[PDB]
């Protein structure tokens, strides 16, 4: 049965992040633009399978952009959700990762420096997109993609930022350098040090 | 003396869009994001300027991305303002656009049709991004483009309308349908109309 | 049946387009070429369908550059097939084509003009791609697109030329100006007038 | 003085890379296509002193295609013809890079697993553009370049190869597969080890 994708349920509140992200901004967040992309995407997809079974290829060509932004949305934000935590769990105590965390320091020098790295790159996207830690190979690298573009080419997503206006406008306005700043204090290791371990299939599962 | 763009003052208070646009985001749109494009582009054009005269074409393709940014970020928000005004001016009124609204018409059937039309494109961007009505030949078109890059590529804007987040979210928050409906409340149709009848070099005098 | 899409026939013999086209390219540019969009757009297809069936949204974003690369190759090179005929042949003769040529004077001055800015359009393609003439409304527009992006987006394409390398340079070398210049004895107008009195499903009727 | 660029003398005659590469695709790629990188490079850069110091910036913004394209033709064509020497050399074999290769060796397993990813990602370019080893950090990296993008970004380029169609088609026709394998015969490892211990600015003062 093609496009029965459901808004998945956050693991904690909506205020759970404060004060790094707020109630508010979490609920929008979720309950709308996730929501959104969920329903657009099934929308889509439906209509896709229409398409592929009168081997319309004009049709099909024409719906990738829909599948690939909403599709992209749903991915990204399912990773997302599980990739933040409450500040005051022992998940978002980077100790929760011993061996992604050493090969961090093994690539940046020390966790601090990948932070300044990873800031800088989410601070340079231009436009809407997202910045990401990925495994590529055996090896870690940063990566950034433009709007909803998930990280599908083979790389296994470790964790992700979004640097949409909305994931930080109602709070800190035009200060993303802030928003970047303190996301640190929610970011779940627990979850990082998961999909470090496991394969692009692992990462994948939860959607 | 390259790179030396200021940003004017608005001509209009910041609460002057309201209730269409309101005064917190004219605010921290021209202030904030506008200056910044301003100050941004200046330093990439000054540091474009060592790497062309010392024949660095890896450091100037470099630079690209810095300059068609925020150079596209000051050209793109200059032609808004330009084209924005409170909703009580006549200026606000398409009766200022007789020349403009006839072509209009003869292309999209109405004001109306088109404004549909329009806000079909504007809605219709992923991720941020503008929406331009522009002349092309003789004749009107709906285009967008992505992030701030601009309509330099020969055709004419018209007018803009900004669909960044940060444009519209601190008062219609996801609903950026409202924002399109509610915007044409506040559009400068006399700035449109001069922009119509003149040619590229001549809407781009914003900038001087 | 997903993705049993077969070569169509050539509506004439490989030297047909001579001189404008030498009868060595027309070979490999349908046996080779189009071929290869061919079996590589039904293998996407394929998998394609797979990852439909199974709600796999990372390996459809994935599959989807050959998707849009393959089936607009195969897409175009059909169109382009049908938009070429003998120099010799009424159907190449732009009388063939009143309301399409009537349009374009209206639009570009003369057939010359438009000609002229076409070749202009074509000559300014960086790398691979494609010049279209396309009705978008009632009215008419030169477009370019890059690799083989397809004319899906709404409106009707009405002739395309083919800027690849592989078109043009075993007869003309780096001489695509020229290329550009003698395409004109063979396009079709015949089949131009069609598309261009007709909507866009119809044109891709082709397929 | 701006725009004073010229075409770099080839280190070997026009047939010195038979039978990979042919005498006559030699010439004509030199020649011709990257003379004309070369010219039109100056030209832009020339035009865009002008609007520069004119602060005439939607003119700038208009000049960057130009810019990149030719100037990335110009620095992709000069480090294309130093890494390629004659097959009979004995710079042509791997073993004049043995540091590089020893960190080709960590990276894919083997000389022969790195040839078969690099093959991969140079027949999977769709359109025109180039394939590189590059070296980022640390590391060694595979990367893709569309039409004449460079490798401008940070990375240093130890080697490239040119998949646009005129790098090879007079030869091989469709055949880049049969390309790609020969190619290999007229690599210059010496080249390729030279850039791999250097400095990214070392590896472009070749300009
Ligand atoms: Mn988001
Ligand atoms: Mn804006
Ligand atoms: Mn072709
Ligand atoms: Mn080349």
């Not at 933040?84 to 050493?102: F, G, K, W, Y």
């Not at 300044?116 to 950034?144: D, F, H, Y």
């Not at 909305?166 to 779940?188: E, F, M, T």
Request: proline content about 5%.
């Amino acid at each position: 049965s093609v496009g029965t994708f459901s808004l998945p349920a956050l693991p904690y509140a909506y205020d759970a992040l404060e004060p790094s992200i707020s109630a508010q901004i979490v609920e929008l967040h979720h309950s709308k633009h996730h929501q959104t992309y969920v329903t657009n995407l099934n929308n889509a997809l439906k209509t896709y399978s229409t398409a592929l079974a009168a081997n319309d290829v004009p049709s099909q060509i024409a719906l990738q952009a829909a599948i690939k932004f909403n599709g992209g949305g749903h991915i990204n934000h399912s990773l997302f959700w599980e990739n933040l935590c409450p500040a005051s769990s022992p998940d978002a105590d980077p100790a929760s990762a011993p061996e992604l965390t050493a090969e961090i320091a093994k690539t940046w020098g020390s966790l601090d420096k990948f932070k300044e790295a990873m800031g800088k790159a989410l601070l340079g996207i231009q436009g809407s997109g997202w910045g990401w830690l990925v495994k590529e190979g055996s090896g870690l690298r940063i990566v950034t993609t433009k709007d909803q573009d998930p990280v599908v080419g083979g790389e296994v997503p470790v964790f992700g930022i979004d640097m949409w206006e909305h994931a930080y406008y109602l709070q800190y306005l035009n200060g993303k350098a802030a928003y970047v700043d303190n996301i640190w204090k929610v970011i779940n290791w627990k979850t990082a040090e998961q999909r470090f371990k496991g394969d692009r299939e692992d990462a994948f599962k939860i959607l």
